[PDB]
Amino acid sequence: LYPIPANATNVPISIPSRNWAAFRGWAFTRLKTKETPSLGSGYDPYYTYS
Amino acid sequence: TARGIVTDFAFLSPLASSAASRSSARDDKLTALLAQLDSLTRELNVVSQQLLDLRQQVSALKAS
Predict the structure, then answer these.
(1) Cβ-based burial of A46 (10 A; exposed 0-12, middle 13-18, buried ≥19)
(2) Which residues from chain A sit within 8 angstroms of residue B10, using beta carbons?
(3) Which of A12, A21, B22, B62 has the most CB within a 10 Å radius?
(4) How far apart are CA A33 and CA A9, in angstroms?
(5) How many whole angstroms separate alpha carbon A3 and alpha carbon B55?
(6) Distance from C-alpha of B15 to C-alpha of A13, rounded to nearest angstrom
């Protein structure tokens, strides 16, 4: 995932040197921040959305 | 917690590394935008100067 701040139109992503064997596709989408939980941590005290 | 969480907001983890590169790109964009804006402003100024001449022309039109 990558942040898109308020009223921002440019979203540059970079990847350092890598070996792209068998890579097959990119796919994308855009989602609102407050809807997406901060996964990887058990509890998200700021996640005010249901 | 309503007044508790008014401190220590969220964080941008994957935007630390590209700080320099993004700042450079932003400055380049700013340079281009400034050039475009200067050109547009000069064009608008000459257009306004032309547009005043219209008054003279019309007033001159009402000659009988």
Answers:
(1) middle
(2) 33, 46
(3) B22
(4) 16
(5) 53
(6) 9
